[PDB]
Design a binder for this molecule. Structure first.
Ligand SMILES: C[C@@H]1O[C@@H](CC(=O)O)[C@@H](O)[C@H](O)[C@@H]1O
Ligand SMILES: [Ca+2]
Ligand SMILES: [Ca+2]
Length: 114
């Protein structure tokens, strides 16, 4: 199925944070309104934060995460969790290789902020 796409409440601030666990340099692209809204890049094998930023959900609430390593799109897994009907986590893992640890770039989106 389509992965890494999440519908957020409109005009809502959310945080997006990316970690790396791979030999390769990860390029995390965050699209709000089908237009690019933030880009994280970095390399780590120790869960290093390669980016963190607060964005606004925009008119449509459509937020998309895309991961590529060396210009090759990683395979994505994703899901959304809601705790006490109020605290939202949009979760993405990605695989750039063959071991299928899906942690090569990990992306968390959380809202609401404040
Ligand atoms: C250190 C390795 O880097 C990548 C590929 C090469 O090797 C990742 O896909 C692996 O999961 C692992 O983190
Ligand atoms: Ca991997
Ligand atoms: Ca890995």
């Amino acid at each position: 199925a389509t992965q890494g796409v999440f519908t957020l409440p409109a005009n809502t601030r959310f945080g997006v944070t990316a970690f790396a666990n791979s030999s390769g340099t990860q390029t995390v692209n965050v699209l709000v309104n089908n237009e690019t809204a933030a880009t994280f890049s970095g390399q780590s094998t120790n869960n290093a934060v390669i980016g963190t930023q607060v964005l606004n959900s925009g008119s449509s609430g459509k937020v998309q995460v895309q991961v590529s390593v060396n210009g090759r799109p990683s395979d994505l897994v994703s899901a959304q969790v809601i705790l006490t009907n109020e605290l939202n986590f949009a979760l993405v893992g990605s695989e750039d290789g063959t071991d299928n640890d899906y942690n090569d770039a990990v992306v968390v989106i959380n809202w609401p902020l404040g």
